[PDB]
């Protein structure tokens, strides 16, 4: 298993995703690549393109679901997302640098996010986004399969930081279902409420899911680049569903002040006692 | 019917595409929007969150497709699509402008695509894109449904130029499927060459469809804004599915240099004699 | 001579701006671009910096003035000036792409800007700009000098459009001085008003100028691409003064809506029978 | 005096710089911007354009100067520059948005840098900068004047990172006067080297200077943004002229691979005991 669950969650991010598009050069890339990713400064995920341009399935592994809502989340699904951790921001800037450049040709960079933990774990609107985060026992059951591999779901979701901040405090809070004075549970707020629809306990059949979100700003933007781990995609896809009213006409609360511009499922290999497996994909 | 087969197409247009945040304020934002739905210099297209957003669903819009396959189609889904057309590159500036503050709060503006016709219907890598369109009669046969809609699909496809002119002219060719010296058609170029791909007459049961795409530059690059209009997505969700690899192993040239970065499907309301015809809508 | 007064100007332009990094390779660079300098199509200009790091002075060529005045004039001088006219827009897009490689490593990109002529020879805020040009014989009196050289100044205004179309039209009018129903001549505007400050008569010494501005729009915004052609840089520098409060403390009313992004003074090399004439520059 | 020199500096800053545009409600902005300027988290300075509009001049302050050589260092002098020093990223991206809205309509944000202190000191291209400022003792003798002033230069610096670490690592040293491998200095490296440009103890009359740059990560790219505090701009001034080759034919080898997109002269008011003293200014 790689380090996606590691605490502390270092100071800055740097996800990357590429698109394969000279897949001859791919044996050349793959080769600079692996003897890099360590699972803990470097991390790696498989997309469903990459798998399917090799002929080999891996189980679980599909591309972001089509949610045909009225809430848009799109499915940008990439064929590889490099995770990168680290508390220099300027040597996470330098080495996705090299990464692009190593890559090349077979894979061209299609999308990056230059991430930063805000406050330790807070998102840029002052809420505590992972208080109700498996315990650190926990962590590894709802995240690690059997094999050792995790199933990640990636959302860069933008704000409107100048809207929601406008609004009362009240409203603030409806929204995401706690207060921002205190991150007390608001039990009677609306069944939207961020919190209300997304209670990982609601879910009768489901199960939980371990986030390691950061926070991000652009020329695009700034907000959330949502990451969620575990053991399948059905406790996440189940949650999306819900918040896009889905299972039930209501819809998240979120979408009033953020929407996500990107949409992407990652199959994490494990680690074996020689770098990173990716045994099964040959 | 809107004027979606007018020929020629002026010198330049423009893209919009809305996401629907406030539901509340859309009866404010329509009774400012569809007086000005001309059909000619202002065209409309509804997508299918709106649709959902609205419960009155309409008979064959739906999301733009998951494509499971080797290659990126993305599918990035909006909820409202308005298609500015006209000779005057800075009035289609300043319209876009107004149209973006009459539909806040309701719908806030997700892409904006600058697109203009270059040298009368040529793509920026010389290959004139169109010849095989259906003849003027034929159009509105392949393009109009019962009603007067159309059902259209749009794709912003980023080239890369620098790479595409920097091979030989024979292997540009055979990606095309056509000589960029007289258009002529490469009997014995590839099946993976795009007009082999995208033999109208190739597919045994499917039908034509007509292309109005246009070339585009912006900060994201440069590439064509792919438009196809049909009677129903049939016609192009087949043509994709032969492009990704889906019908049979082997993918379409154009994603050696060219990948879409959106796509989306949106449904042409028709033309009454009192404006646009969003009654089965309401 | 050049053709930098030809009428009807093409309805797109595109503005190359170039900093000299690599002068062991410039050898390289003028040999593959002086060829293609015909004066019509693609136009050029020396900056100061070029002229200084070949050591000759070429008369009446100087950076762009420092203006210590209440408004901002930032002078952005570079090396190098493209001037490319064209009606098809995605021509001077590939062209400026071929410009930028044949002239590396010598020549870096340092500005572009998209051009096109609004409506004619309109500004974005409605009001024809270039009433009072020179007559078309007054053209080549004010604009060109003895040797046929010309002495351009350029300046890249960024418009807030959302703010003075806000204004009543009033306060418009009295802006630039000039009646947007009829564009006739406020009489009693503002001393303040761009017309009241530009008055090319109301310089007792000085003489006129020939504008060939084109309108812009970029990630940066929009507005207008400034450009002032003259026997000299005298016309436009005593104008700018004037504006900037400088020859009396009333500041133009450009300032309140407008600000340049940009600014340099390039000198345009005469046409002789054989390309373009740089012999003073050797 | 602000706290232009407290160690160690934050891991984050952000450099505002505005332009005035609406001095009507200057007062406005100023009322609720003063009390706010505590020197160590907020540091304030007054721009050329900002003292000329109000009148008063203040001494020692002047705009970015021209320098007429054959490398490029532009002017883009501003009003006002607002200074952020934190450790936390996203509370610098917060504010700089509670500070933008705090000073419209008077003050507009023209640019905006954010800036991260790269390995406690170090520069993009990994060449220790700060080694040679003076000791903890001198700094004050250096930066600040008698009342208690500082006169700050800025210019941000874009790096040519890919060409720059292409060189050999004997070409690198050579153009920064130092090895990479122990910061140690290359004693017969060419004149043209940047620590043998900028020898502060080479200049016969001339005195120390105090810099406080950051590394920054844009859209434009990314490189040093380059901060020189001192009791006047003689100093600095000084030591660009001597590195565009003015003093002496020989320019800088900086400007092989990096070049200043912005500069300005910026006077730090003093502090008294009830906030920041602007009483010169009025
Ligand atoms: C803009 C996007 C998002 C924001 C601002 C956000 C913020 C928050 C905040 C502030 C909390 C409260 C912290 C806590 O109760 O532990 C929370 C909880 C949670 N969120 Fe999100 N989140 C976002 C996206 C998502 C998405 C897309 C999902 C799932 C598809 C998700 C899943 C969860 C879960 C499972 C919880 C735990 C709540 C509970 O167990 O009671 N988040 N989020
Ligand atoms: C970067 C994207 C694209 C480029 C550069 C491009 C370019 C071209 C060119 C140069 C032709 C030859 C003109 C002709 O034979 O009429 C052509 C034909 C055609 N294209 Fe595309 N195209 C693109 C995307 C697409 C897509 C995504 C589809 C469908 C899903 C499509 C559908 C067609 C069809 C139906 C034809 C007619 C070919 C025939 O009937 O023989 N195009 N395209
Ligand atoms: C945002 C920037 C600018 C805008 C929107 C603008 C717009 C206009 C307009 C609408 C006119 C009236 C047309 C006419 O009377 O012929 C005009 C006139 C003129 N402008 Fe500008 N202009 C700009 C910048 C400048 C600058 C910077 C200068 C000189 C330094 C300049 C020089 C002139 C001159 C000489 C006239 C002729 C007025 C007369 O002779 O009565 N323009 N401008
Ligand atoms: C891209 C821009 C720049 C880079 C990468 C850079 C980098 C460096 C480095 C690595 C050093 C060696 C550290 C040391 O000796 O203390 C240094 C020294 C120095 N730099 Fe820069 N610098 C830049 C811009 C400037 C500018 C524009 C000036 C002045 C106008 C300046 C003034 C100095 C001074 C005074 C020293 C001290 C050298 C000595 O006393 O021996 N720097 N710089």
């Known amino acids: 298993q790689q380090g996606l669950l590691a605490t502390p969650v270092p100071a800055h991010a740097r996800h990357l995703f590429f698109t394969l598009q000279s897949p001859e050069a791919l044996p050349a890339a793959l080769?600079?690549?692996?003897?890099?990713?360590?699972?803990?400064?470097?991390?790696?995920?498989?997309?469903?393109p990459l798998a399917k341009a090799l002929g080999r399935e891996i189980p679980g592994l599909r591309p972001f679901p089509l949610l045909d809502?009225?809430?848009?989340?799109?499915?940008?699904?990439?064929?590889?997302?490099?995770?990168?951790?680290?508390?220099?921001?300027?040597?996470?800037?330098?080495?996705?640098?090299?990464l692009e450049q190593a890559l090349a040709p077979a894979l061209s960079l299609a999308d990056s996010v230059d991430g930063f933990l805000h406050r330790g774990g807070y998102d840029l609107t002052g809420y505590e986004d992972g208080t109700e985060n498996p315990t650190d026992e926990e962590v590894v059951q709802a995240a690690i399969?059997?094999?050792?591999?995790?199933?990640?779901?990636?959302?860069?979701?933008?704000?409107?930081?100048?809207?929601?901040?406008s609004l009362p405090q009240a409203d603030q809070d409806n929204i995401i279902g706690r207060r921002l004075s205190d991150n007390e549970k608001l039990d009677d707020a609306p069944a939207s409420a961020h919190v209300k629809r997304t209670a990982q306990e609601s879910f009768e059949p489901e199960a939980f899911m371990v986030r390691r979100?950061?926070?991000?700003?652009?020329?695009?933007?700034?907000?959330?680049?949502?990451?969620?781990?575990?053991?399948?995609?059905?406790a996440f896809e189940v949650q999306l569903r819900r918040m896009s009213g889905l299972?039930?006409?209501?819809?998240?609360?979120?979408?009033?002040?953020?929407?996500?511009?990107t949409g992407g499922y990652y199959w994490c290999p494990p680690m074996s006692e020689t770098g990173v497996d990716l045994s099964p994909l040959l």
Chains 1, 2, 3, 4 share one sequence.
């Open 31 to 48: 080769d600079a690549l692996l003897p890099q990713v360590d699972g803990k400064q470097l991390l790696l995920g498989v997309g469903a």
């Open 213 to 234: 979100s950061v926070s991000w700003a652009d020329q695009r933007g700034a907000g959330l680049a949502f990451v969620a781990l575990g053991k399948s995609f059905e």
């Open 69 to 98: 809502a009225a809430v848009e989340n799109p499915s940008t699904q990439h064929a590889l997302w490099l995770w990168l951790r680290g508390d220099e921001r300027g040597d996470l800037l330098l080495r996705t640098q090299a």
């Open 247 to 261: 299972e039930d006409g209501i819809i998240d609360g979120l979408y009033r002040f953020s929407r996500p511009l």
């Open 145 to 165: 399969a059997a094999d050792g591999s995790s199933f990640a779901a990636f959302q860069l979701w933008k704000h409107d930081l100048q809207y929601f901040k």
